[PDB]
Design a protein around this ligand. Structure first.
Ligand SMILES: O=P(O)(O)C[C@H]1O[C@H](CO)[C@@H](O)[C@H](O)[C@H]1O
Ligand SMILES: [Mg+2]
Length: 448
């Protein structure tokens, strides 16, 4: 009874039965009715169908009197940046990010790149598109091509003092997504020596779909770091709004620890600022933010919640453990580029390896990583967990599912808003043994 491609935060589906040019044009028409006055920025990723879906979007938008600013093949963050920079009414990125070959999708924003989500306009668009049987009208507005990335590149470079950068050797792995175009445009302005892996955009994805979380894709970056003696490695998803770090030993760094690391990096430039973090893994971030003189602000996980809380708090930075990093001056939006520029500067200025910058934090606050469970009855499973631990009287917080703080250890257990899954995160106060026994205990209870 409902179009399956319309999800909580974006549109995503198999082409062509769940998403196609006709739906894309109808989405353009419906989006025009939902935005304030102004033109609409469109960009797309490397997938084979993405240009044609963008063209259909543009045709619907222009049939509805919206001028279209075509920024071309880009990363999702460039749609965010240009929507805000050009003071557009909104923007759409055509992308499936990390999904398989036969999938595509769209990420929609309104003014200042504010997200459009299921409860803030996306399901309104879905319902309009679902009932729209009108004949396609003809264009009454224009499309302008604006592929200049100069303002975007200057904005990225403004986060670091380039005279303090050292000629680090960096592995970069675009995964045949789009990140390599931006790296290559930044490189004339940077002293780094880049080691390029899976660098060329290829929507056929000959080296695997761009998802650095798959261990086999992870190992391509690790090996390049180790074989070339690189200072660290960076990998991106296909639309490069997520970045992933490998230290000089080839070790993939759990994203939890990048939140505290980037917060300290930013707070050095913006003293006393607020930093937004999610509730899944917290202790390390709270401590690092406070030690840097910042103020940590707890917020439900999900990019729309993070961005809204950052805005209401004038927070300079927000970070999620799931490799999303948000920057006030970047229209409160996430970037897969700003994070590694900041880390490169921190390594250059401190004389410490990425490994040593996080090592003590990982020992002090070891974490399970996010563990997902598909169970027969999520509500019953969660109840089994809470009944088992009731006699210990944990401190409970319901910001985002259930957070339970036992003193020396804590967990977060929540339902995903994008998949029918339970997600589990556990951390402890410097106790790897406790981390494992509690994680396994909860896992058995969930699976019971
Ligand atoms: O499925 P979940 O866990 O509700 C939402 C997931 O996707 C969101 C958008 O990519 C992320 O902001 C969030 O951190 C992540 O857990
Ligand atoms: Mg992505």
């Amino acid at each position: 009874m409902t179009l399956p491609a319309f999800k909580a935060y974006d549109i995503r589906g198999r082409v062509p039965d769940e998403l196609n040019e006709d739906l894309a044009r109808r989405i353009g028409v419906a989006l025009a009715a939902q935005l304030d006055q102004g033109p609409v920025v469109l960009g797309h990723d490397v997938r084979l169908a993405s240009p044609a879906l963008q063209e259909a979007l543009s045709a619907g938008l222009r049939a509805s009197g919206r001028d279209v600013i075509d920024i071309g093949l880009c990363g999702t963050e460039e749609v965010y940046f240009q929507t805000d920079y050009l003071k557009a009414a909104g923007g759409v990125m055509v992308t499936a990010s990390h999904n398989p070959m036969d999938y595509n999708g769209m990420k929609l924003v309104r003014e200042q790149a504010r997200p459009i989500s299921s409860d803030t306009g996306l399901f309104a668009i879905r319902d309009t598109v679902a009932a729209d049987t009108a004949a396609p009208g003809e264009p009454t507005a224009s499309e302008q091509s604006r592929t200049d990335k100069t303002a975007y590149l200057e904005h990225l470079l403004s986060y670091v003092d380039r005279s303090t950068l050292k000629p680090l050797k960096l592995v970069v792995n675009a995964g045949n997504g789009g990140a390599g175009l931006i790296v290559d445009l930044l490189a004339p302005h940077l002293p780094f020596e880049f080691v390029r892996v899976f660098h060329e955009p290829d929507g056929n994805f000959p080296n695997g779909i761009p998802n650095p979380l798959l261990p086999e894709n992870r190992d391509a970056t690790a090996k390049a770091v180790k074989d070339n003696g690189a200072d660290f490695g960076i990998a991106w998803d296909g639309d490069f709004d997520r970045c992933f770090f490998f230290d000089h030993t080839g070790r993939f760094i759990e994203g939890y620890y990048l939140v505290g690391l980037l917060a300290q990096a930013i707070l050095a430039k913006q003293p006393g600022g607020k930093v937004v973090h999610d509730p899944r893994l917290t202790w390390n971030t709270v401590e690092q933010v406070e030690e840097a003189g910042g103020i940590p602000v707890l917020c439900k996980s999900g990019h729309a919640f993070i961005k809204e809380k950052m805005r209401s708090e004038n927070a300079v930075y927000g970070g999620e453990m799931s490799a999303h990093h948000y920057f006030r001056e970047f229209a409160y939006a996430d970037s897969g580029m700003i994070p590694w520029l900041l880390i490169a500067e921190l390594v250059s200025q401190s004389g410490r390896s990425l490994a040593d910058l996080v090592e003590a934090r990982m020992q002090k606050f070891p974490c399970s990583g996010e563990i997902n469970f598909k169970v027969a009855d999520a509500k019953a499973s969660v109840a089994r967990v809470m009944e088992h631990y009731a006699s210990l009287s944990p401190e409970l917080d319901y910001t985002d599912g259930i957070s339970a703080d036992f003193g020396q250890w804590r967990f977060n257990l929540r339902s995903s808003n994008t998949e029918p899954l339970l997600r589990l995160n556990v951390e402890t106060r410097g106790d790897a043994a406790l981390l494992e026994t509690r994680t396994q205990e909860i896992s058995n209870l969930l699976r019971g």
